[PDB]
Each structure stands twice: as C-alpha cells, then as structure tokens.
Amino acid sequence: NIGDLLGAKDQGCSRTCESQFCTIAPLLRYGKYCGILYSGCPGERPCDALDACCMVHDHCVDTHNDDYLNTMCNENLLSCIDRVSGATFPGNKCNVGQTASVIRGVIETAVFAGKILHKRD
C-alpha cells in the first residue's frame, strides 16, 4: 500500500472545514470528513449535517476492518444523506445539495458492489 510509506492517530487528518473539488468525486474534500481517503482528527466536530454523515461512515469503515464495501456502513450513509438539513459552515464554497448528490452516487455503487460480493460468497 502507498500509505505504508507514511510516515499515528492524531496525524494525516484534517482539523479544517474544506470545500475543494465540490463536483469531482475522486478529489472531493468537504468539511473535515467528506471525501475519499480524507478524514478528521480524533475528537474533531463535523462542520455540518453532511460532514456528520461522512464522519459516521469513516469510523464505520475503520471499525469493520477497513471494508469500504460494508453494506451497513454504506446504506446508513445513504439514509443520512437523504435527511441532511440546516446551516452549513461559513466559507463553504460548495453547494450542499450538489455535493451530497455526488457523494450519494459513489455510495450507491459501493452498496451494489458489496451486495454482489456477498450474494456470491
């Protein structure tokens, strides 16, 4: 793994509310937790409702042997995303609705991929 070159719990993590590549799924960084291989430092409070959904998911994957295809983790995220509301963080350069839909797309695909691998195994 590329992460084996690096390099702790309170390191390699975010303490700041990002809003970068709002519509590009592989590069998206939103809040402290929303984004692939992008997560907040231990104890860091999420930046809004959407970021809070991603925080739960990130921890869910971590506590299930890094299984990013875990169906529970992914289905719970879908449910959370559909119910996102309230103020977002000051200085958020992303559209909440648009970014949530971009994430939802990836997670729908993750749910299917997980289900496929279990229906065979």
Active site residues: 57
Judged by CB under 5 A, which of 18, 30, 39, 40 binds Ca ion? 39
HEC string for the chain: CHHHCCCCCCCCCECCCEEECCCCCCCCEEECCECCCCCECCCCCCCCHHHHHHHHHHHHHHCCCCCCCCHHHHHHHHHHHCCCCCCCCCCCCCCHHHHHHHHHHHHHHHHHHHHHHHHHC
Binding of Ca ion by 58 (CB under 5 A)? yes
Consult the annotation and say whether 30 binds a ligand: no
Nearer to Ca ion, 32 or 119 (CB): 32
How far apart are alpha carbons 31 and 94 in whole angstroms? 10
Q: Output the six-digit token pair for 45.
A: 């409070």
Consult the annotation and say whether 40 binds a ligand: no
Nearer to Ca ion, 27 or 118 (CB): 27
Residue length of the chain: 121
Which range touches Ca ion (CB under 5 A), out of 6-14, 20-28, 32-40, 63-71? Answer: 32-40
Consult the annotation and say whether 51 binds a ligand: no
Which range touches Ca ion (CB under 5 A), out of 23-31, 50-58, 72-80, 90-98? Answer: 50-58
Which residues are annotated as part of the binding site for Ca(2+)?
A: 33, 35, 38, 58
Which residues are annotated as part of the binding site?
A: 33, 35, 38, 58
Residues that bind Ca ion (CB under 5 A): 33, 35, 38-39, 58
